[PDB]
């Protein structure tokens, strides 16, 4: 399986360049990743910055240096020669279509499979706004043509021995790692549903886009939204007879053994009673 693992320094290195040149509001900052991967698994650790500029009115305006930016990789080659160019990362807040046209220029200098990440200047979402792209030829059922498109894959943040405790040493404020972490994650799971519910509000706007003037309709999106009914809701009521019994067994074994282990603290009164007998010298 292809799983992109991103180092958090990539987000911090680009965050500095967003403040310096004041790059934001539909302005993409192009960058390149680094690592050694001969397998499908992609490991992203070090990253560079490409001085890219674009126009907001014209999405076809792009300028990228080929061998002038690779001097940073030549300087890093003498540092670490094990890692080479495995891909590249962009910003794309509105996801410009310039990356769809040419997949060759970025693949010429990267011998690995084509990979395109997303680093926004905002990245303030509680969810997982960081997304990965794989550019291949995929068959489309929309009825137009089969061409190179983006393939989405899940990614995450890398933690190694260097930066694991380094970030925790900087924060050292709110951690709270215990059995009580269920209330934080399950609430975030509810926020994940509410986060997708906010994405469903964009689906509400998707119909308004059809209501708008001269916009097409994507047939691929309709295929996924068509099965939302027959899948998973009074249809499941027939299976709720044997399903509720499985949830009750969890409560049966839990409540009988939960009141046992808590009865071993009786020694508190026993030790406190012996303290009064030790008061002869007190």
């Amino acid at each position: 399986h292809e799983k992109v693992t991103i180092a958090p320094l990539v987000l911090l290195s680009a965050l500095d360049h967003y403040e310096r040149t004041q790059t934001k509001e539909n302005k993409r900052c192009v960058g390149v990743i680094l690592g050694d991967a001969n397998s499908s698994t992609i490991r992203v650790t070090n990253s560079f910055a490409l001085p890219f500029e674009e126009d907001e009115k014209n999405s076809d305006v792009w300028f990228l240096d080929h061998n002038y930016i690779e001097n940073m990789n030549e300087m890093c080659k003498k540092i670490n020669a094990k890692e080479k160019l495995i891909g590249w990362y962009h910003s794309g807040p509105k996801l410009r279509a310039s990356d769809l046209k040419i997949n060759e220029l970025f693949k010429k200098y990267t011998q690995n499979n084509p990979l395109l990440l997303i680093v926004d200047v905002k990245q303030q979402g509680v969810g997982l706004p960081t997304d990965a792209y794989v550019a291949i030829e995929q068959v489309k059922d929309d009825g137009t043509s089969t061409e190179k498109t983006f393939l989405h894959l899940p990614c995450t943040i890398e933690a190694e021995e260097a930066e694991e405790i380094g970030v925790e040493h900087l924060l050292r404020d709110v951690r709270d790692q215990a059995a009580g972490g269920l209330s934080i994650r399950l609430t975030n799971q509810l926020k994940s549903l509410k986060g997708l519910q906010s994405k469903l509000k964009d689906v509400v706007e998707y119909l308004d886009k059809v209501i708008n003037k001269e916009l097409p309709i994507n047939h691929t999106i309709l295929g996924k939204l068509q099965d939302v009914f027959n899948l998973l809701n009074n249809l499941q009521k027939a299976l709720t007879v044997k399903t509720n019994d499985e949830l009750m067994v969890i409560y049966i074994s839990n409540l009988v053994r939960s009141i046992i282990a808590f009865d071993d603290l009786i020694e508190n009164k026993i030790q406190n009673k012996k303290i009064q007998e030790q008061r002869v010298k007190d």
């Binding site: 049966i252 009988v256 009786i266 009164k269």
Partner: protein, 207 residues
């Protein structure tokens, strides 16, 4: 012997019922007595499958068959249970009760109730084999009365000993599956008053 009053009988199956010594210990008990309690209690605890794999497997029984036939339980209670024949099993109840349970030195105190339980268990196991059976079909040839048959079975309902299907006025008699999600949950109900007995008892002055 101590478990005979509590009627556990399970811990005595591999200890009292199963004897290492073929001949008795003298001052404790008797040779005919130690071989008698193995057959009486063994039929109550060990199932019918264990009857042919244990009781007849032990050499102690083979020596009793060719010597002392006065017990009469070797050719009656063992064969009638193995053959699953209730017609022959009924008349051997009193014949064994007279020559075994009455002279018995332990279980003679509580006897008739112990027999009425195992009396139906022979027919209760046979009920699992057949699906639909009438009331008067094979019960008339068993040598028993229909009225007295329902009286003993009618009193076993409050003891939770009947999950099966028994009918009289019609006579459609079927079998059921005692393993289900009802008795599965019954383990928690039985422990309601027994688990909290000592929890709220000693928690007065201490804790």
């Amino acid at each position: 012997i101590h478990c005979l009053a509590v009627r556990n009988f399970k811990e005595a199956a591999k200890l009292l019922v199963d004897s290492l010594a073929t001949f008795t210990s003298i001052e404790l008990t008797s040779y005919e007595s130690i071989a008698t309690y193995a057959s009486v209690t063994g039929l109550f605890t060990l199932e019918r499958t264990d009857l042919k794999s244990k009781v007849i497997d032990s050499p102690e029984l083979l020596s009793l068959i060719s010597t002392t036939a006065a017990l009469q339980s070797i050719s009656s209670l063992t064969i009638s249970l193995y053959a699953s024949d209730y017609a022959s099993y009924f008349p051997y109840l009193l014949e064994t009760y007279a020559n075994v349970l009455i002279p018995c030195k332990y279980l003679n105190r509580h006897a008739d109730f112990f027999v009425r339980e195992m009396r139906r268990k022979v027919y209760a196991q046979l009920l699992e084999s057949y699906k639909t059976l009438s009331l008067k079909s094979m019960a008339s040839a068993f040598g028993v009365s229909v009225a007295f048959l329902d009286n003993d079975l009618g009193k076993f309902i409050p003891n939770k000993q009947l999950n099966c299907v028994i009918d009289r006025v019609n006579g459609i008699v079927e079998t059921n599956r005692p393993d289900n999600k009802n008795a599965q949950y019954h383990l928690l109900v039985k422990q309601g008053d027994g688990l909290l007995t000592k929890l709220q008892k000693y928690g007065a002055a201490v804790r």
